[PDB]
């Protein structure tokens, strides 16, 4: 079978400015080779067909060149928007074969997070559960450290925290971070804290409640 | 409009065996080869095969020889594709595609799972701001299996939305969404997150209500 490289899993990049994807084919595919943008949990879009030809509707922002091995798509102007992965595939013989994709990834502005805390719902805790759920919201950079205390004692056990892929609106990245309890550990304690360090501020962002309140 | 219709949804068991549907429209159905190819859980594309709808004839990835079988049935304009003895290594998402005059058309993928583990609805549970911008959240816990749809307001509600990847805890998964307004906005307006699990036949709306 025909190998398709693409040997950038990853590359940084500016709004602005012009990024080359590349891809290398394991033998001849002529300019049998097509290019694909994937938006997290959507189905593929194709963006150009015989190496350098753009679909229909497909902004003139990206162009294509390369035949026998080597392709390259380009963008220019590049754009929160183009924050995708991208696939190329030879379609010159059977088996059609894809590249491994290339995730962009855009540097821009710090941004301090911001920060919800939410005591367990009234409906969970008739079921017996205690969810306390941390939103921090649109930071960058993506380094951040969350901590969670209860009744002023660090808590580690119980947290599941998950990231959203970079923003395609605005090149920000979010978190949600989840405190599981049994209702009699949430019952046991009073006060509940989602504390951020962050390399925008000297000190921590804190969010606090108190069950009784 | 060229459309292909797959269903979101199948949940197997392991050694099993499904059928998977493509259901096309707006085009003359036997003038275009049909192709359909696998995503997996956080990886790459892979091409499975294509087959022309006007005689059946297919090309097959040989990866897949003995694991998929492709048909048309041409009066209900649909393509299959069969998958025998079903491995964990199966799952993912399987899109249906073709491309008619330069234009390419998806079908929204099927996300087949393949796991002994039971179909379980989520209980959905709306969170409202501790007693010049509010966030309020949804907290959507315990299903199985992926995916869910959430919304807000039935989609109209869609700007400054976070709805994060869910993660799996002892073989069911939870996951939340955040939502942004205005202080002017909320609660003198509604919010509602809309839930829908289709595996569990589940749809639910959750108000948002100041504690
Ligand atoms: C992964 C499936 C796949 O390989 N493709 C595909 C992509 C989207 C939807 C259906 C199939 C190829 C795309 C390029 N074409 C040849 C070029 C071309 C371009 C425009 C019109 C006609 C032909 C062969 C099939």
């Known amino acids: 079978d025909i190998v398709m490289t693409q040997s950038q899993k990853f590359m940084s990049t500016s709004v602005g400015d012009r990024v080359s994807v590349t891809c290398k084919a394991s033998?001849?595919?002529?300019?049998?080779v097509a290019w694909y943008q994937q938006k997290p949990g959507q189905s593929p879009k194709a963006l150009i067909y015989s190496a350098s030809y753009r679909y229909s509707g497909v902004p003139d922002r990206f162009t294509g060149s390369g035949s026998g091995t080597d392709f390259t798509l380009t963008i220019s102007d590049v754009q929160s928007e183009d924050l995708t992965e991208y696939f190329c595939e030879q379609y010159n013989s059977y088996p059609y074969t894809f590249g491994g994709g290339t995730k962009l990834e855009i540097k821009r502005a710090d941004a301090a997070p911001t920060v919800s805390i939410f005591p367990p719902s009234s409906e969970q805790l008739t079921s017996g559960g205690a969810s306390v759920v941390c939103f921090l919201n649109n930071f960058y950079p993506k380094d951040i450290n969350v901590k969670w205390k209860i009744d002023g004692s660090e808590r580690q056990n119980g947290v599941l925290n998950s990231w959203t892929d970079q923003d395609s609106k605005d090149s920000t990245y979010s978190m949600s971070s989840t405190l599981t309890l049994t209702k009699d550990e949430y019952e046991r304690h009073n006060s509940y804290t989602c504390e951020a360090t962050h390399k925008t501020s000297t000190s921590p962002i804190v969010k606090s409640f108190n069950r009784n309140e | 409009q060229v459309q292909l219709q797959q269903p979101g949804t199948d949940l197997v068991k392991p050694g099993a065996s499904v059928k998977l549907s493509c259901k096309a429209s707006?085009?003359?159905?036997?003038?275009?080869?049909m192709h359909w190819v696998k995503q997996r859980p956080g990886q790459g594309l892979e091409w499975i095969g294509n087959?022309?709808?006007?005689?059946?004839?297919?090309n097959q990835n040989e990866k897949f020889k003995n694991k998929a079988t492709l048909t048309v049935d041409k009066s209900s304009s649909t393509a299959y594709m069969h998958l025998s003895s079903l491995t964990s290594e199966d799952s993912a998402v399987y899109y249906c595609?073709?491309?008619?005059?330069?234009?390419?058309?998806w079908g929204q993928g099927t996300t087949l799972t393949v796991s002994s583990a039971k179909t379980t609805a989520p209980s959905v549970y709306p969170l409202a701001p501790v007693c010049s911008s509010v966030t309020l959240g949804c907290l959507v816990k315990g299903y199985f299996p992926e995916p869910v749809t959430l919304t807000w307001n039935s989609g109209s509600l869609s700007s400054g939305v976070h709805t994060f990847p869910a993660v799996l805890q002892s073989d069911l998964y939870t996951l939340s969404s955040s939502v942004t307004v205005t202080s002017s906005t909320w609660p003198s307006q509604s919010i509602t997150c809309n839930v829908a699990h289709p595996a569990s036949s589940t749809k639910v709306d959750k108000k948002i209500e100041p504690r």
């Open positions: 707006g085009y003359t159905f036997t003038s275009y080869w």
């Open positions: 595609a073709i491309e008619v005059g330069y234009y390419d058309y």
């Open positions: 033998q001849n595919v002529g300019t049998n």
């Open positions: 087959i022309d709808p006007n005689n059946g004839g297919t």
